[PDB]
């Protein structure tokens, strides 16, 4: 049996107080009747508003990034600061951060390890570029990204790990991976985890797909046996996030 | 006559809800009886708490960084998002961001220009390294940093600019610039502004000093004619920020 699914909203760098209040009300009013962990990841400055307004019992709040330690890091938000304010989920290694903001495999791996030590649930993002896919390097890349993370984790830390496979070419581009494309990658990831980390770990691990998930494509993705839900960007700013949650039934 | 001074607290990546509530109460209870703009720059996730608790009428709240535009920038906070939530001050180009987080002169200049266009008051940070100082390059460096910013500003934008001269070797090191060291740089900066931007602009411009400012050294710094207040890191997490404010009398 599949583990508990996750439907996660990565709002990225978007929102106003008014738009968030309206969308949160929509999410609150959508009654969910199956076992699913819903996640909303607002910008840092919007975390308190979401904490104040979001009440749907299936939801938890995540940060979109963090640094490991407090101190003289003007502009950054640390893991201890998030834990103190009640945020104990974090997205780490998103492609935008890997690409724009210097986050190498080593940096991502270190952040994931620090977050697990500090008691976070971590949505750790992996995924190949268009060039890597066309060179037949998808497996090599996602396994190298995953193994880099794994090298800094104890076995027991994996209870806190969620993988999000987001092919870079599918992020924001209007070009979702097909169910077959996504399932092939999720299958190979789960096999690696089973063999390298443990059979128990692999059975319980959520491996989410992201990159152009929408209300219309989500259910046929979720029907694949190794897809455990979604990390949703653009559609998660809209009422159709409700449909995406319901696609994990 | 000097323009209105500023006393600015850069909390950097520090705080808990409990510590912030206590410190804000201390700041609230310290009654200020002269014309000074006090500024507190909390981490992004702490902005709403500070907005809720800080009531001293001499204070405004600043961000420690921003990006110019909303969109698909996971982990970042944009200038429109800050304006919407009521934050209309921002620190840009802090040395930690120049050094750790890729912010070149071009990047800082672009951010300052975008922030001014969006109606922010901007505390734009400049300053030389220890090696640059020892090579007799202090003036060259701070004027190059300032001119890079200036090249992207209209004259009228300078009504929104505050410069913060923070020699890198003084930040967090227990080694404040002497009043004479700081004044020499502030004098040369103001002369450049007077000649390159305008005499009116230079007379009104606040040029703040930062780098190891504390309660005991602040008044003799402020006595210098071209120092208009302070950008304070470590001491601003403590009750002696009150003394620093009072040193601008």
UniProtKB/Swiss-Prot annotation, chains A, B:
Pathway: Carbohydrate biosynthesis; gluconeogenesis; Carbohydrate degradation; glycolysis; D-glyceraldehyde 3-phosphate from glycerone phosphate: step 1/1
Keyword Isomerase among UniProt keywords: yes
MF GO annotations: triose-phosphate isomerase activity
EC number: 5.3.1.1
Major place of residence: cytoplasm
Gene Ontology cellular-component terms listed: cytosol; glycosome
Keywords, alphabetical: Cytoplasm, Gluconeogenesis, Glycolysis, Glycosome, Isomerase, Peroxisome
InterPro entries in the record: Aldolase_TIM, TIM_sf, TrioseP_Isoase_bac/euk, Triosephosphate_isomerase, Triosephosphate_isomerase_AS
Reactions accelerated catalytically: D-glyceraldehyde 3-phosphate = dihydroxyacetone phosphate
Location of the protein in the cell: Cytoplasm; Glycosome
Amino-acid positions noted as binding substrate in the UniProt annotation, renumbered to this chain: 10, 12
CDD domains, per database record: TIM
UniProt-listed Pfam families: TIM
The keyword Cytoplasm belongs to this UniProt entry's keyword annotation: yes
Signal peptide: none
Active-site residues, Swiss-Prot/TrEMBL: 94, 166
Domain of life: Eukaryota
GO biological process: gluconeogenesis; glyceraldehyde-3-phosphate biosynthetic process; glycerol catabolic process; glycolytic process
Family in the record: Belongs to the triosephosphate isomerase family.
Subunit structure comment from the entry: Homodimer.
UniProt protein name: Triosephosphate isomerase
Organism: Leishmania mexicana
